[PDB]
Amino acid sequence: NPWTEYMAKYDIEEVHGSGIRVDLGEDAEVAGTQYRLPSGKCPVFGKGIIIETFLKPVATGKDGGFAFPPTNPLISPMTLNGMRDFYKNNEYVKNLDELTLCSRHAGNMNPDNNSNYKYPAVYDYNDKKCHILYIAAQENNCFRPAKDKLFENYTYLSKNVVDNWEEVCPRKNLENAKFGLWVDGNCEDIPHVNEFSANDLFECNKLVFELSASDQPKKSHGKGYNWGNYNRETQKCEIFNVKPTCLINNSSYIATTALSHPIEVE
């Protein structure tokens, strides 16, 4: 299989290793109490929390969001330039990409009296700000995780986001391409898919996310309906839960994943 190296980033169970829709793949203790917390190794592009907004500071002392309360010095929210300046003496941190840097910055804040509880974070590409999430919960349905037009520039980050996610994690959608399974020198179609109707790529990506690996009933370890072949002509989102191992050239298709950005194509 000549697709091995290229298709490696789409082995989400391996490269992400946790829930996508709801990421709670690890447990950490704070002062003798066990808490669940995100642990996915890949960034989730376009993911936010809908409250029936969540980047607002959490209520201290209940009309607030999930983000960190004001501090001195204010470390959340913090711009990319603010973070790089804050770690200007740390060569192991100052040159990290914006997503990994946001993750390491969030994981720097220990609320314990040397535990391993590290807050999840959200990087907003719009104004280039890193928001440390004080609330690691993602669904209580009251709130729910979702991909939305309002969330297209958000990026949900766990503590385990790898510094080379650009190389090993999905981001772009593959235009004129179709996920398949490599069998005997040929790339065959996914034998069984679950067809959901979708107006565009965004809606297809939203559906895949909704059906994707979840560590909470509405640990997955990355298992789930994480992939989708979107036929832009028949407007069908073909969703499946087995990892693809090759690509089929088809101008009618766009290959998307739950981790992938809802809009960007390549």
């Binding site: 470390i75 804040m109 609320p111």
Partner: peptide, 13 residues
């Protein structure tokens, strides 16, 4: 309220 894990360790209230 928090203490930075990475050196130098400073306490942000």
């Amino acid at each position: 309220c928090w203490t930075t894990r990475m050196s130098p360790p400073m306490q942000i209230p």
